[PDB]
Amino acid sequence: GIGKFLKKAKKGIGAVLKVLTTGL
């Protein structure tokens, strides 16, 4: 879940937020 988006947001966030928009 989002737990990965906030946890991964540390550095490589542009990747999570990028894909997170494909499912949001």
Short mmCIF file of C-alpha atoms in Angstrom, two decimals:
data_model
loop_
_atom_site.label_atom_id
_atom_site.label_comp_id
_atom_site.label_asym_id
_atom_site.label_seq_id
_atom_site.Cartn_x
_atom_site.Cartn_y
_atom_site.Cartn_z
CA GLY A 1 0.00 0.00 0.00
CA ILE A 2 0.97 3.63 0.53
CA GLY A 3 3.40 2.36 3.14
CA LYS A 4 5.80 1.80 0.25
CA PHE A 5 5.19 5.20 -1.33
CA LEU A 6 6.01 7.07 1.88
CA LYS A 7 8.84 4.69 2.80
CA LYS A 8 10.33 4.73 -0.70
CA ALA A 9 9.72 8.48 -1.00
CA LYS A 10 12.95 8.82 0.99
CA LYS A 11 15.05 8.98 -2.18
CA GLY A 12 13.63 7.34 -5.29
CA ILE A 13 10.15 8.83 -5.03
CA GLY A 14 9.75 9.97 -8.63
CA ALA A 15 9.34 6.28 -9.40
CA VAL A 16 6.67 5.47 -6.82
CA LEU A 17 4.65 8.66 -7.28
CA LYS A 18 4.93 8.11 -11.04
CA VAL A 19 3.33 4.66 -10.92
CA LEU A 20 1.07 5.56 -8.00
CA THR A 21 -0.75 7.80 -10.48
CA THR A 22 -1.43 4.85 -12.77
CA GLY A 23 -3.48 3.16 -10.07
CA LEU A 24 -4.79 6.14 -8.11
#
